[PDB]
Every structure is written in structure tokens, then in C-alpha cells.
Ligand binder design. Structure first.
Ligand code: VO4
Ligand code: VO4
Ligand code: VO4
Ligand code: NA
Length: 129
């Protein structure tokens, strides 16, 4: 599914990401924009052989099992394919574990380089929610 901006903002707020560990909803929307272009089906292979999955590009090196990332962890206790669903529940629940692990949203390279320190409220401007 390719979400609209406000449709994804509403879904993320319903799943408890608004101000989760102090990150406003616009941070999560901005991160999803630059990680996946709001596409739940997005996949991208990393140089080290891991893959990033779904709307928030969650990495098989640590967080999910994709059957082909040797010596990796599955800290969200999910198959990586769960992260590609039209239903963002699995991605949000796993993202809450990632952002809680000590590095905050710096785990998301696109958030650090494109969202951090910008006017992220712009991402939810005009949205009903
Ligand atoms: O892309 V690599 O060590 O898995 O983060
Ligand atoms: O109700 V689903 O969040 O598991 O749309
Ligand atoms: O999941 V992202 O680390 O590719 O920036
Ligand atoms: Na893994």
C-alpha cells in the first residue's frame, strides 16, 4: 500500500507513535517519507547482505528474520515479510522497540540526515488525523 501523508499520520497516531519517546508525529511521517516513500512494500538490500523492510525500512541485521541474513538477530521476533503488510501494526510495534534501544531515531539514517532538526510539523500540516 502507498499511504498518503495524512493517512499515514493518522495510522501512526492511532498506533501510539505521536510523542513516542518524545518524537512528535511529524518525525515519524518524515522518516517514513524518506525511508520508503510511504510504501509498505519497500525493500532495499544493504551492502553487508542484510535487507531493510517496509514503511520504516527495518533492518534484518537486528530486528527481523528474513532467512538469508547470517549471524543476525530477530529482536522484534517477526518474519521480515510481516513488515510489508498494508497493516502497519507490526512495523510500528517493532519501531517502538528500535527507538527505545538507546539511539532514538538516529537508527533511521534517512531521519538523521533529512528530518532531524528540520520543521517536521510541516509533515502533519492540514491533516485531520
Ligand atoms: O546494514 V548493516 O551491519 O546490517 O547495519
Ligand atoms: O487493526 V490493524 O491495525 O491490526 O488495522
Ligand atoms: O532504515 V534507514 O537506516 O535505511 O536510513
Ligand atoms: Na535477522
Amino acid at each position: 500500500k502507498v499511504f498518503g501523508r495524512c493517512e499515514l499520520a493518522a495510522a501512526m497516531k492511532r498506533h501510539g507513535l505521536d510523542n513516542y519517546r518524545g518524537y512528535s508525529l511529524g518525525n515519524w511521517v518524515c522518516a517514513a517519507k524518506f525511508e520508503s516513500n510511504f510504501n509498505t512494500q519497500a525493500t532495499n538490500r544493504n551492502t553487508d547482505g542484510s535487507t531493510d523492510y517496509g514503511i520504516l525500512q527495518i533492518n534484518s541485521r537486528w530486528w527481523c528474520n528474513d532467512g538469508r541474513t547470517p549471524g543476525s538477530r530477530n529482536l522484534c521476533n517477526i518474519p521480515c515479510s510481516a513488515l510489508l503488510s498494508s497493516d502497519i501494526t507490526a512495523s510500528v510495534n517493532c519501531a517502538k522497540k528500535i527507538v527505545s534501544d538507546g539511539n532514538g531515531m538516529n537508527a533511521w539514517v534517512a531521519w538523521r540526515n533529512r528530518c532531524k532538526g528540520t520543521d517536521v510539523q510541516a509533515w502533519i500540516r492540514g491533516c485531520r488525523l
